[PDB]
Amino acid sequence: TPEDWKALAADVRSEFQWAWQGYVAKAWGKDEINPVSGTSRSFFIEGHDLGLSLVEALDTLWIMGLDAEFQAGVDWVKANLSFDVDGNAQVFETNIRLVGGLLSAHLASGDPVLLAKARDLADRLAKAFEASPHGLPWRYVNLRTGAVSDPETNLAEIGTYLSEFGVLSQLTGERKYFDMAKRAMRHTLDRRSKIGLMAANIHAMTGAFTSRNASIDVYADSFYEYLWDAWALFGDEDCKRWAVECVDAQLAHQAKRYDGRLWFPMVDFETGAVTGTAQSELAAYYAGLLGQVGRKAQGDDYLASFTYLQATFGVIPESIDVTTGQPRRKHTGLRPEYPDACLNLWLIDRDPRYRRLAAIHYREMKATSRAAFGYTALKDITTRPMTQDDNCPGYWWSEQMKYYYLLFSDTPRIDYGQLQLSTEANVLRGFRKV
Ligand SMILES: [Ca+2]
Ligand SMILES: [Ca+2]
Ligand code: NA
């Protein structure tokens, strides 16, 4: 019997609403729910929660037509959320989760307060960029005082701002945000090796690389997304060029086959010698990026490596050894990158294969991660049954339930031709208001 995609979408929505009810009951205004114990935890600043999961959920709720829930969340933000806090926030996570989550909720609703708050937060983050003579952000900033800490940063944490900051520039009229984000990316691109790669680790004050490892994976990942995304969102010609050049260099020097499967291990950024054998589950975003930049066959080949992991292990292992294709770790982070890739590739030509694969992933999530008050990360994927930890990461609220719903629902609330998603799946273009 053919899959009833609309029924599956309705199931995703039902499960999301059920999870939201758990959040309201156990973690209202708090950063994350721990859905096994039915408690909450902080994310950015211990003991000074910022409603993280609530903010992350907002655009998802609106897209699903969970309007009462959306408005309850928006109304909480408007009454309660502020960033004048004497504590250190990680600049990267704060931008993609809170600035981006407020922006997508603003674009869905039109509510000016959500933009005001996004902009206030971005101005606090800007101090981290201003503290570097290169415009490379320090990793942490005190939200009240502007004091910075830890300049030993990485491509992802210097280069995952241009989508949110560029949208701020469009909405506010002030070019400073776009300019600040782009300058940091240009810094590392200008320091590409002769083979077109950047090392993943960089110092905000010296402006120099602090390792020799080029990566598509953790430390680097979303830098490469945001090059393409800035072309798509802003028509930036430099970013269009850079996106394709960077991916070309990765395909030339990092694409390696092991046991017939495509992987992208770390390599020396100048010599191309392989320098690692690990691949994170988090690398699966790259299958979608490959399609976006005009390398779809390569993207499908890379997706197939993760499809192998899903078919073999049920849940994709958090990290694997590329030389054996086996897990390196047994726990998980309830990770969204497989349906991320499926949605991004499906947006190209609507091939139902991607729906098939994402449905496996959703059903596996239901079979493994469901807990009393929501969905949780896993302790051990190798035992039967798989054992659970006790945490619903904030990104779950923005990412995989949205990906599944967008893949299955054909919702009239999104213009699928104009849809743009941040690395946190915040919708930054494509809302069709009712
Ligand atoms: Ca991401
Ligand atoms: Ca992306
Ligand atoms: Na969101």
Ligand number, closest to the Cα atom of 104: 3
> Measured in angstroms, how far is the CA atom of residue 31 from the centroid of ligand 3?
13
Query: Residue 113 burial by CB count (10 A; 0-12/13-18/19+): exposed, middle or buried?
Result: middle
> Measured in angstroms, how far is the CA atom of residue 2 from the centroid of ligand 1?
31
> Measured in angstroms, how far is the CA atom of residue 425 from the centroid of ligand 1?
7
Question: Domain containing 418: what range?
Answer: 1-434
Which residue numbers belong to the known binding site for Ca(2+)?
A: 225, 423
> Measured in angstroms, how far is the CA atom of residue 118 from the centroid of ligand 3?
13
Q: Are 7 and 344 in contact (CB under 8 A)?
A: no
> Measured in angstroms, how far is the CA atom of residue 424 from the centroid of ligand 1?
5
**Distance between alpha carbon 140 and the CA centroid of its chain, in Å?**
19
CA distances from 270 to 189, 214, 246 (A): 14, 9, 14
Preceding residues of all breaks in the chain (C to N beyond 2.5 angstroms)?
A: none
Q: Please count the residues of the chain.
A: 434
Resolution in A: 0.9
Q: 10 Å Cβ neighbour count for 375?
A: 26
**Distance between alpha carbon 57 and the CA centroid of its chain, in Å?**
13
> Measured in angstroms, how far is the CA atom of residue 419 from the centroid of ligand 3?
14
> Measured in angstroms, how far is the CA atom of residue 401 from the centroid of ligand 2?
16
Sequence-ordered strand ranges (E) for 230-377: 256-258, 261-263, 267-268, 278-280, 319-321, 326-327, 370-371, 374-375
Q: Would you say the C-alpha torsion 217, 52, 100, 181 has a positive or negative sign?
A: negative
CATH code (residue 371): 1.50.10.10
Number of domains in the chain: 1
Ligand number, closest to the Cα atom of 426: 3
